[PDB]
Point group: C3
Chain length 216, copies 3
């Protein structure tokens, strides 16, 4: 019924297939590699469920500021974005202190994202967007300045670059889409997030899980 259904359906499909691929691929005894397979398989598994929830209409609510807001995205990102950061952190043997900073900053990013998404005073939505963007920028700063076997170095560099590029798109899509200024229709916005989500999840995992960096 809703025009964006096609992109929700494809996202569900692609997340589903990616999960099954990583699950089959991970069938691995090396403790380190097992950690990467676990993190990297859980990511699209979670996204699969949240995409499904949006397709079926459960992960959608109306916010008066009567705007269709897919809140399920934030339930997804609350878990999947810290997991993706753990993949990076583990590659480089990050100190626990740096892990907590990343995870905590990420929680703030998604939580303020959600508050902004659900806020009924239009102008205040963008205050929450700004705070969330600050947390994102802190995360990007830590990834470049806050942190090594050569193969770990090469793979970390690729994944970090992928991360900086894709993650930076999210706040732009939100600002111009139905959560923000409403300059890009919900249908197109759903498509953008779908492309970003699959790349950031399945794309990312493929690069990581095909590299020898994950073995001790």
């Amino acid at each position: 019924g809703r025009p964006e259904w096609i992109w929700l359906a494809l996202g569900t499909a692609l997340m589903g297939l990616g999960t099954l691929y990583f699950l089959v691929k991970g069938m691995v005894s090396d403790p380190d590699a097992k950690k990467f397979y676990a993190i990297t398989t859980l990511v699209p598994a979670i996204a699969f469920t949240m995409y499904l929830s949006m397709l079926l209409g459960y992960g959608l609510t109306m916010v008066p500021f009567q705007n269709p807001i897919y809140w399920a995205r934030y339930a997804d990102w609350l878990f999947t974005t810290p997991l993706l950061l753990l993949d990076l952190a583990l590659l480089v043997d990050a100190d626990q202190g740096t892990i907590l900073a990343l995870v905590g900053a990420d929680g703030i990013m998604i939580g303020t994202g959600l508050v902004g998404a659900l806020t009924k005073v239009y102008s205040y939505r963008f205050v929450w967007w700004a705070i969330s963007t600050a947390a994102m920028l802190y995360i990007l700063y830590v990834l470049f300045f806050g942190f090594m076997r050569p193969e770990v170095a090469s793979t970390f560099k690729v994944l970090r670059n992928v991360t900086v590029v894709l993650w930076s798109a999210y706040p732009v899509v939100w600002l111009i889409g139905s959560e923000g200024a409403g300059i890009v229709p919900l249908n197109i916005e759903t498509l953008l997030f779908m492309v970003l989500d699959v790349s950031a999840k399945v794309g990312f995992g493929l690069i990581l899980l095909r590299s020898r960096a994950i073995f001790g």
Copy 2:
């Protein structure tokens, strides 16, 4: 007022008493044993609070598909089921990678359980049930195939068998009860969950905390 009150009241009582028993019993210097006492005491403490919430009417909502759904169960299981899995994982010195898989799969199980519980399209409730059951089955697979001092071996075998049997009952009760097909009345369903919950929590803890497997 509501017929199931008696089973909510007994569950609250039994969870309460089990918590106090484990608390008194744990009054223990061995680091390993302290970890088991903590996990195993927190479990029925959480369940106590969620049983209380249901007795008092706070953990109950009406879902139109006007069906009384005790959502408090899922707030309980979200924390207590991973904790029970940590008890198992620690016994056998599981690799962190295997722990994340178990915990993550468990989160998916309960989260999709909850979505199914609260879904307003009747047919879709059972799609969520199926996904949750898949996650449960993955958990059971890991417990048997994804993993040792003899006393650890004996105790792990008992607890794992208890786990496989009791946990497998939960999806059956849900399917036939008020969350699913509505073939078994809410009153009887509440009783089944109460028996399962106490066994899976207090029964489980008694077997674990009386074994010498918990000491290094």
Copy 3:
């Protein structure tokens, strides 16, 4: 508009400034010290966001028992109180078992706090208050009886004393304020929590982050 706005605004300001101070101060290579800076900076960062949410009206709901309840407090405390306990636990090199007990007990404290805050049967609100207070008392007991370099000893003693005093005020404020008996107006209650929150967060962090106890 609402009289308590001034205290929400100052709390937001003070939490904001404290976060920036700790962030600048932490600009530190020692792994141990990094852990303390992370925990201690995240704390007022979270509180900043939740104070903002209350100022802007998002973190407030009406509970019929038509009472204005700031639920945002509990979203704050759910994360910040375990973090503050981790600061203490790490100082003294607590066993993981003791950490889980503290964190778990803290989760119960805040969760039952929230249930009480949102409960529509007046008398039952204080049952939840009593359970939460029991969990708090268990936490205080562990801090004194459940647990060392001299500088670690001195700093831990100060922070623990600060903790026992400030934390014990929270249940009293709740009982006499708008969540409980309604003997102290919401405006004054908001002020009390603001003073307690800043002391418990910024005060606490200043004492910790100025001590040499945080370096290995």
